[PDB]
Amino acid sequence: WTATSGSCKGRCFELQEVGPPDCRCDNLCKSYSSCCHDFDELCLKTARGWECTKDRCGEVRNEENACHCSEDCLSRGDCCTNYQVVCKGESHWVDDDCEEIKVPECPAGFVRPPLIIFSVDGFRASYMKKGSKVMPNIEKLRSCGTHAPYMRPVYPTKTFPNLYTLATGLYPESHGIVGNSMYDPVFDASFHLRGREKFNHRWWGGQPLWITATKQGVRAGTFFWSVSIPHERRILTILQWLSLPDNERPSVYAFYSEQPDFSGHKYGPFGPEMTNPLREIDKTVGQLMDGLKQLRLHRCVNVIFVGDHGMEDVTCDRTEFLSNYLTNVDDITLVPGTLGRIRAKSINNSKYDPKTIIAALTCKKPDQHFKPYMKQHLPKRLHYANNRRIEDIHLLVDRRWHVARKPLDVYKKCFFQGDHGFDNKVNSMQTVFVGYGPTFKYRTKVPPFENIELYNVMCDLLGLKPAPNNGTHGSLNHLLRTNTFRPTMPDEVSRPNYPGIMYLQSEFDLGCTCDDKVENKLEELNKRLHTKGSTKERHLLYGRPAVLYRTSYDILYHTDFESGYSEIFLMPLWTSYTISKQAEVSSIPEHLTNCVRPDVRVSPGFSQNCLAYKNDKQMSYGFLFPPYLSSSPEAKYDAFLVTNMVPMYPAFKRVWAYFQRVLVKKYASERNGVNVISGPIFDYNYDGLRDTEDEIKQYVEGSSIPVPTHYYSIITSCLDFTQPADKCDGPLSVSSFILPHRPDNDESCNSSEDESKWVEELMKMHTARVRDIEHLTGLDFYRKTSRSYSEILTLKTYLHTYESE
Ligand SMILES: *[C@@H]1O[C@H](CO)[C@@H](O[C@@H]2O[C@H](CO)[C@@H](O[C@@H]3O[C@H](CO[C@H]4O[C@H](CO)[C@@H](O)[C@H](O[C@H]5O[C@H](CO)[C@@H](O)[C@H](O)[C@@H]5O[C@H]5O[C@H](CO)[C@@H](O)[C@H](O)[C@@H]5O)[C@@H]4O)[C@@H](O)[C@H](O[C@H]4O[C@H](CO)[C@@H](O)[C@H](O)[C@@H]4O[C@H]4O[C@H](CO)[C@@H](O)[C@H](O)[C@@H]4O)[C@@H]3O)[C@H](O)[C@H]2NC(C)=O)[C@H](O)[C@H]1NC(C)=O
Ligand SMILES: Cc1cc(OCc2ccc(=O)[nH]n2)c(C(C)C)cc1Cl
Ligand SMILES: [Ca+2]
Ligand code: NA
Ligand code: NA
Ligand SMILES: [Zn+2]
């Protein structure tokens, strides 16, 4: 119950929310149905519109007007935004030349440059170039400030998951807003775009920027604007707040526009109807900048222009229906559209079986426009599994398509021409970032980056300590003129052992065999050198990875590769090798097909054994350093060491063998050499973080050999490909992947074909940042380079997306 009988007199858009049942005059009062009786009258004036005209100049103040053109409006903080232009002969901000803001130029009493986040819904990255002719204010911010060609949103590429990621620095699986629609089974409660439940605080996890600021003594304006408040009034409210006394004035503000998303859904991303919404958003930017210029704040405030996601062409006819696949369609609940999430309709139905639903959805139609996954098998770069609100069964929908349960859902539940929600590497889902102000760089273009990184930067801009988040703090230092965050590298927790030769061959009883007893001071001294690390500088180019947790491991050196061998997991944590452009590929000799060799530096008790693989009828093995890329027949024997072996399902060995035999050489040819680090990953609780030994759910039958959930490779070369990977004087170039270690290739519908037709496609889908691999392994890479630490942090956040230009 709201006692709407109180008054908003002098309380309009008050910053502190008054507690029930007193009536409210803050911005959220509309949403709660709780505004005081006179909120519209006092707080939402529209009389005479939003612009001064010549005849209004120096008018007598009339408090009825939406905004003012009287001589007292500046000191009142409530002129129409074009007041100085119409009445005082001033220029619009957009008509003024760009001039570098070398230092903040702030009115007295300003303790720090304020930050204004101007957020636009559905603003696709390519609008910056394609609409630049009708967005002169935005184009000036872009060209004069710091801008990326695009910014990558989080998955799913929906509004609230992305806005809340902007606010928190967290993946949606961590902040809890995992869709615009959700069921939480612990709460037994449903979140929807419409209604009141969505405001309940239990949905919203982590710590958004306005709470971070407030806890640290920095005041914040409204982030969530009620839809019915017009944009001109939002701008006027921000400008009014900026005129408050020092002790009352917020330092951080947000504006939000529902456009161009609103029209994009109706007309498609490039519908001729789209030019007008773009002009209108630009005009709003112009109002804000003119207003800042009036307040003498246009060279003091940092402004961020940022979108939540893009927009793709999608129509009703491009819908796949689950009723064309499933017999049991009425026993499931589907969350539909540009992604699908499936759960049982009733928890009392014990005939419900995820495995038969996945199977009925897998490669059933030749041009099928969605792919089903158990959530733990989705690409790890989506970071979309570790939350009870994410259903176990997920459908990844191809761009331009929808999925629905039944046809009647699409006409009785074509209207639309645009939608979004798809895989966040898809080009049409990319959105915008521009930063303009004293703290941002001048006329500077930065490479694309992910929106999870912005919270840290916003905290840097405000002098706040960020709450723990998923950005990599320092990775965006190159956007900033000042206020950079200068991190130190994490400390190594576990130092390696460097074992020498300590075991005789007969101490081992591993059930392995090798045809290797085939017999020199010329060549024996040299091989001893190789086992002590004499080639290490060729194969370990950026220092050894640091192990950031407590464990027992050995560094093992070889002619062609170096490894960090875990005595706990019985296999390498990492294996590092360099392949020059000139390297040659060779086969595994006939006599060495089943060759596995005890490693005399590592005890029998800390070694794998061949018998376990013999007896595990489902599991085979592969090697981390590939025998195919051996530098010489003699060095090839090193590749068959038991310490270079890892468990691999036959189906996965198809993928891995093609990568090692074909693709590594292809990359070395194209990139002028590559350095490769490969290894296993164990993430059985799908939290994106390295499993401890007691979280392992599967072992090679009868043994203590843990089965990886994934295998990674980090492939580094010189950004200037005129220099070979091993003699690179400057910046680096990286691509990485995290391949799921699965016992079938059901994910690849074309897997009956030659690996050349499907393997690299799979690997592209499972592209990864080096940072993703760090989280999953407890390793820290690139510890010894000639590059700045912030540059290396940006490299570790790089994702190679394989999308066209
Ligand atoms: C992205 O960045 C984020 C942020 O840094 C990373 O997330 C952190 O990861 C940590 C490890 O997973 C995690 O640490 C745990 O904290 C527990 C305390 O939990 C509360 O307090 C924090 C701090 O305020 C709060 O943020 C939490 O909020 C979560 O939960 C609520 C709802 O319950 C949500 O509103 C919110 O969105 C968030 O949910 C997310 O995280 C939780 C896990 O916390 C998931 O369950 C959700 O799916 C969702 O993703 C909490 O309110 C603490 O209890 C844990 O301690 C256990 O484990 C440690 C191991 O060190 C052990 O010492 C303890 O014994 C303890 O075990 C006991 O409980 C076990 C489980 O019941 C039991 O099995 C044992 O037998 C023991 O009795 C743990 O330390 C931290 O909370 C989150 N922070 C956030 C914000 O998510 C994330 O990892 C990064 N991602 C990547 C890929 O890098
Ligand atoms: C910049 C920004 C805006 C924002 O909400 C704006 C909004 C969205 C829908 C709406 O109806 N009204 N307003 C959020 C939300 C509160 C999570 C976070 C951030 Cl970071
Ligand atoms: Ca884990
Ligand atoms: Na086997
Ligand atoms: Na297949
Ligand atoms: Zn939308």
DSSP letter string, 126-180:
THHHHTGGG-HHHHHHHHHSEE-S-EE-PSS--HHHHHHHHHHS--HHHHS--SS
Identify whether the C-beta of residue 598 lies closer than 8 Å to the C-beta of residue 650.
no
Q: How far apart are the first and last CA of the chain?
A: 55
Residue 653 CA neighbour count, 13 Å, CB half: 12
The one-letter amino acid at 479: L
689 annotated among ligand-binding-site residues: yes
Which two three-digit tokens encode residue 369? 């426009």
**Number of residues that this document lists for the chain:** 805
**Residues 6+ positions from 780 with CB-CB distance below 8 Å:** 489, 490, 492, 545, 546, 548, 774
Which ligand minimizes its atom distance to the CA of 743?
A: 5
687 annotated among ligand-binding-site residues: yes
Atom of ligand 1 nearest to the CA of 386: 48
Cα-to-centroid distance, 470 and ligand 3 (Å): 16
Which two three-digit tokens encode residue 804? 């066209």
For a mutational test of ligand 1's pocket, the pick from 173, 174, 770, i.e. the residue with the most ligand atoms closer than 8 A to its C-beta, is 174
- Name the residue at shortest CA distance from atom 46 of ligand 1: 387
**Residues 6+ positions from 118 with CB-CB distance below 8 Å:** 254, 255, 257, 285, 288, 303, 304, 305, 306
The one-letter amino acid at 112: R
Does residue 224 line the site of ligand 2, with CB under 6 A? yes
744 annotated among ligand-binding-site residues: no
- CA distance linking residue 54 with residue 46, whole number of Å: 19
- Name the residue at shortest CA distance from atom 3 of ligand 2: 223
- CA distance linking residue 805 with residue 29, whole number of Å: 45
- Name the residue at shortest CA distance from atom 12 of ligand 1: 687
Cα-to-centroid distance, 378 and ligand 5 (Å): 16
**Residues 6+ positions from 240 with CB-CB distance below 8 Å:** 13, 77, 78
Cα-to-centroid distance, 681 and ligand 3 (Å): 9
**Residues 6+ positions from 567 with CB-CB distance below 8 Å:** 552, 553, 554, 602, 606
- Helical segments of 54-126, H only: 73-76, 83-87
The continuous run of DSSP H or E covering 760 comes out as: helix 759-765
What counts of helices (H) and strands (E) characterise the chain?
A: 22, 29
709 annotated among ligand-binding-site residues: no
3-class DSSP assignment, residue 578: strand
> CA nearest 765: which of 795, 787, 745?
745
72 annotated among ligand-binding-site residues: no
For a mutational test of ligand 2's pocket, the pick from 163, 234, 462, 469, i.e. the residue with the most ligand atoms closer than 8 A to its C-beta, is 163
Instruction: Classify residue 490 by its DSSP letter.
Output: P
**Residues 6+ positions from 441 with CB-CB distance below 8 Å:** 145, 146, 478, 479, 480, 481
- Name the residue at shortest CA distance from atom 6 of ligand 2: 224
- Name the residue at shortest CA distance from atom 8 of ligand 2: 224
In order of 230, 240, 439, the CA distances from 237 in angstroms are 11, 5, 24
685 annotated among ligand-binding-site residues: yes
Which ligand minimizes its atom distance to the CA of 176?
A: 1
Identify whether the C-beta of residue 397 lies closer than 8 Å to the C-beta of residue 403.
yes
The CA angle 675-714-604, to the nearest 5 degrees, is: 85
Which ligand minimizes its atom distance to the CA of 375?
A: 1
Whether the upstream peptide bond of residue 366 has omega within 30° of 0, thus cis, is: no
Q: What is the architecture of the domain spanning 505-797?
A: 3-Layer(aba) Sandwich (3.40)
Cα-to-centroid distance, 613 and ligand 5 (Å): 24
Cα-to-centroid distance, 174 and ligand 1 (Å): 9
Which ligand minimizes its atom distance to the CA of 222?
A: 2
Which two three-digit tokens encode residue 581? 């452009």
Does residue 256 line the site of ligand 2, with CB under 6 A? yes
- CA distance linking residue 450 with residue 169, whole number of Å: 10
> CA nearest 421: which of 407, 442, 400?
400
Cα-to-centroid distance, 333 and ligand 1 (Å): 28
Identify whether the C-beta of residue 715 lies closer than 8 Å to the C-beta of residue 676.
yes
3-class DSSP assignment, residue 404: strand
691 annotated among ligand-binding-site residues: yes
3-class DSSP assignment, residue 596: coil
265 annotated among ligand-binding-site residues: yes
Identify whether the C-beta of residue 616 lies closer than 8 Å to the C-beta of residue 701.
yes
Does residue 223 line the site of ligand 2, with CB under 6 A? yes
Experimental method reported for this structure: X-ray
Does residue 163 line the site of ligand 2, with CB under 6 A? yes
Burial class (CB in 10 A: 0-12, 13-18, 19+), 675: buried
- CA distance linking residue 249 with residue 610, whole number of Å: 71
Which ligand minimizes its atom distance to the CA of 223?
A: 2
**Residues 6+ positions from 492 with CB-CB distance below 8 Å:** 546, 547, 548, 780
Residue 159 bears catalytic tag: yes
Cα-to-centroid distance, 122 and ligand 6 (Å): 6
- CA distance linking residue 771 with residue 781, whole number of Å: 9
For a mutational test of ligand 2's pocket, the pick from 29, 31, 119, i.e. the residue with the most ligand atoms closer than 8 A to its C-beta, is 119
Atom of ligand 2 nearest to the CA of 121: 8
Atom of ligand 2 nearest to the CA of 256: 6
Does residue 254 line the site of ligand 2, with CB under 6 A? yes
Q: Resolution to 1 decimal, in Å?
A: 1.7
Which two three-digit tokens encode residue 525? 């001294």
Does residue 220 line the site of ligand 2, with CB under 6 A? no
Does residue 135 line the site of ligand 2, with CB under 6 A? no
- CA distance linking residue 615 with residue 629, whole number of Å: 29
Residues forming beta bridges with residue 99, ordered by sequence position: none
Residues with CB under 6 A from ligand 1: 170-171, 173-176, 205-206, 383, 386-387, 468-470, 687-689, 775
**Residues 6+ positions from 624 with CB-CB distance below 8 Å:** 561, 563, 572, 575, 644, 646, 678, 679
Does residue 119 line the site of ligand 2, with CB under 6 A? yes
- CA distance linking residue 501 with residue 638, whole number of Å: 14
Cα-to-centroid distance, 775 and ligand 3 (Å): 9
Cα-to-centroid distance, 159 and ligand 4 (Å): 48
Instruction: Classify residue 429 by its DSSP letter.
Output: G
Which two three-digit tokens encode residue 235? 């701008």
729 annotated among ligand-binding-site residues: no
Which ligand minimizes its atom distance to the CA of 610?
A: 4
Which two three-digit tokens encode residue 338? 């540009």
- CA distance linking residue 803 with residue 349, whole number of Å: 43
- Name the residue at shortest CA distance from atom 45 of ligand 1: 387
Asked whether the CA dihedral 59, 61, 62, 64 is positive or negative, the reply is: positive
Atom of ligand 1 nearest to the CA of 388: 48
Residue the block writes with tokens 């007691």:
694
- Name the residue at shortest CA distance from atom 93 of ligand 1: 688
- Name the residue at shortest CA distance from atom 24 of ligand 1: 206
Atom of ligand 1 nearest to the CA of 468: 5
Catalytic residue, from 81, 146, 157, 159: name it.
159
Residue the block writes with tokens 């490894």:
563
Does residue 164 line the site of ligand 2, with CB under 6 A? yes
Identify whether the C-beta of residue 41 lies closer than 8 Å to the C-beta of residue 62.
no
